[PDB]
Amino acid sequence: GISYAAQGLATGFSTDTTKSVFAGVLGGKYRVYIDQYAKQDYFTVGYKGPNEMDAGIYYAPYVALTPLRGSDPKNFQPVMGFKTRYGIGINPFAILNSLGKNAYFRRVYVKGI
Amino acid sequence: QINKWQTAVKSRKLKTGITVELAQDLEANGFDAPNFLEDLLATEMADEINKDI
Amino acid sequence: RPNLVALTRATTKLIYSDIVATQRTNQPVAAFYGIKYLNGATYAGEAGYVDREQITELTEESKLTLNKGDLFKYNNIVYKVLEDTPFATIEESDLELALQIAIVLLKVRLFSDAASTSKFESSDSEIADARFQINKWQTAVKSRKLKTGITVELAQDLEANGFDAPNFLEDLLATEMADEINKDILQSLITVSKRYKVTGITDSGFIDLSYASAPEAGRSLYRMVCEMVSHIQKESTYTATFCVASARAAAILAASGWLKHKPEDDKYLSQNAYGFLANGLPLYCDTNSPLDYVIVGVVENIGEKEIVGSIFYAPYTEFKVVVDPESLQPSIGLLVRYALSANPYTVAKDEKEARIIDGGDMDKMAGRSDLSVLLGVKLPK
Prior knowledge:
Chain B: Homopentamer. Interacts with the portal protein. Interacts with the major capsid protein that forms 160 hexamers. Chain B: Belongs to the Tevenvirinae capsid vertex family. This is part of a larger assembly, with one copy of chain A and two copies of chain B. Chain A is 4% helix and 32% strand. Chain A is mainly beta. Chain A has a two-stranded antiparallel ribbon with strand order 1-2. In chain A, strand 1 and strand 2 (30-32) form a beta hairpin. Chain B is built from two helices and no strands. The B-C interface holds B 8-18, 25, 28-29, 32, 35-36, 39-40, 43-44, 47-48, 51-52 and C 31, 33, 35, 41-43, 112-117, 120, 127-132, 134, 136, 237, 302-305, 307.
């Protein structure tokens, strides 16, 4: 169970599901996350150093989870919502210079499951 | 002689301080944006008033 | 970096910082902001526009079907009809002029859509849209660097001059840097400025005061320059705030009574100004460009922010001086970097185009300022 199903939540009859983070560590080596929107069936292996400049991929959460509020008088109903302004990027390896080129990650399609 | 008369107060409204995606840009420029925007908007208002005169 | 800040203070004071708008960055790129509107008069509300559409375009065949109380619009300006058949007595064939005549003779009346509060609130009428949009774009901070503080025997010379030399040389190096920067600013300004054109270019050709044309007094240029200011007033909600010209173009040419040599050096005039004109505007001079041109345009602010300009400048500090003893020569290197750009929205319909262009790409921004114009000038060399 090194890749965790959060078995204690199962044991307790879904005390949570926590379906948002890396499950655990495969082989005791790779932290494993679930692509909850996978289109076919696959895996990708990637590297991440301790240095933020050694990820190969960057996510920079400027303005995170900022709420909106309002009301629409036509039916006098509430307005509520969220916005973010994060931006992304990769080790340049020269989007046009990203496709199929970034050495930090290797993607394999899986069949036969 | 001194004359007097009464004239109705007329008005002009603007809905111009657009915020939304614009809010996000204004936030990016949040250093100045709150008051900057009101002064900018005031400026356009002043222009129309002056032109009316 | 206080040492660089001190150099910044002692170096940016030497450039034409006010012929462009100044913003600042703290990023490798500078986020610049600016304001633009594409057509100026009255309200910009939908209700306004709709009523205008619903009354008339004032065509020549319709101008006389109008009667007392009617509205019409022309070139987006709404006018009310005073008494019947406006223009019945105006023989002028150019409708725009006929309109100007009609306004003066009170056949028509400049019309205001201002109304009671109740009109607006009761009908749930539309509201004025914005006249100007505020744009943002970013460009890379670019730089120049010098190896010019030469030392070796030069150190010995500097030691001989050691009472001043340490600072003197850095100040001197900063000065030549400032000079090239100022010139760089002018190249960008020159490039972006729209070509002033009237009836096929400034009275059907670039102004020419050459021997074969009009080696007069320089008066005809002064007149044209003043008209360049008018152009700015026509096209934008600002009066010119500065002017720059070469010696042969105007800095000297207009010095026949329509140019002042800085009679006063501290009021409404920068320290870097060559002088100012009889029609105002601090006057600057390039002295380098083969063009021998004149530029008229506007820098303007909302509170502390120089939001309006054709060109925007945004320096990036954290004016670095480095001493490197190559072999026998501890020379001084000087590095200065800044963003400098034109508002890219003057060449874009919307963000999809703005997002694939660069305000720092002067091959696209050329002639697209709208906050400045340039007069090409032929001269009696």
